[PDB]
Amino acid sequence: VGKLNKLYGGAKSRGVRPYKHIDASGSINRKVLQALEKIGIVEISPKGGRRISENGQRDLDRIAAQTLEEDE
Amino acid sequence: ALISKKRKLVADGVFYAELNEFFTRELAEEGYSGVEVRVTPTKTEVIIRATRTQDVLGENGRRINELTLLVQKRFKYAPGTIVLYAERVQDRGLSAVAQAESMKFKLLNGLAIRRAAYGVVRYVMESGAKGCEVVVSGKLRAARAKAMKFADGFLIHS
């Protein structure tokens, strides 16, 4: 999330000054991350970081191929 | 504490810089040339060579009382590692800084315009320096400003 809010940052003006890149919100990022943690898609992995749970792994491999073969 | 990884190992320049400027702006009458330090293993010995060995010996204590105690009271070495005994050493007068001390003495003793001149050129000849170039700013008379100069033997410029 420390890089997610950065990558979602944007340009802001300090009046008669140039535009500076500034980080995005952290509150909503933490809240949606916790929401999906409670739902059980994302999961906190060892050594620092998040991994994908088995519902998301099943959504990744087979049904993605099925959905794209349907809509293509 | 007084320890850092790769900061003081490079910032140590200021110490011997202060040492060098102090030796230049105070240790001038002795003819301070350079510290021929030789740290032998199993016997840490820090010596000094002088072109006026009679003067750095002196009356046995007036210079030594400061010279042996100030180099130790500052950093608190154990005794017997920064030792001050001066001996007869060769090739003391074979350097540009030695010619600089010689012409300093020849300028300070107060000879006339030609006597110091042929004296210094005979001395640099007998030392074997085949060329010199010197400039003196300021003045001899009481006027605005002057810059005298003479160069014997042609040098690359610069």
Binding site: - | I3, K6, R7, V10, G13, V39, T40, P41
Partner: protein, 107 residues
């Protein structure tokens, strides 16, 4: 084992010649007086990580200046000596400033 050979890499690092000649003459005379294997050292392209505290704020005028440069003469020894004498080289000739990286690697 008894009389272990783990070969902690002794990292010869000096700044001045008075200490460089001191430690190099020390280790080679030690090898000479207790008859170590005849394998001597050579220098290196020194391990310079660029760090310094510059004090040149603003760029006006022309350059009548020097170069900020310094050589930490980090050298090494290509030999097969015991870890015992590798440790005793650090024990004797006490001068704070010589670093020894704990590295279990002989060659």
């Amino acid at each position: 084992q008894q009389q272990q050979i783990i070969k902690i890499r002794i990292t010869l690092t000096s700044t001045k010649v008075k200490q460089l000649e001191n430690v190099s003459s020390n280790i080679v005379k030690n090898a000479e007086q207790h008859n170590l294997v005849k394998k001597g050292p050579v220098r290196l392209p020194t391990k310079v990580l660029k760090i310094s505290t510059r004090k040149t704020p603003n760029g006006e005028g022309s350059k009548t200046w020097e170069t900020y440069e310094m050589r930490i003469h980090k050298r090494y020894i290509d030999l097969e000596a015991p870890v015992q004498i590798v440790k005793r080289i650090t024990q004797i000739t006490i001068e704070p400033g010589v670093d020894v990286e704990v590295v279990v690697a002989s060659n």
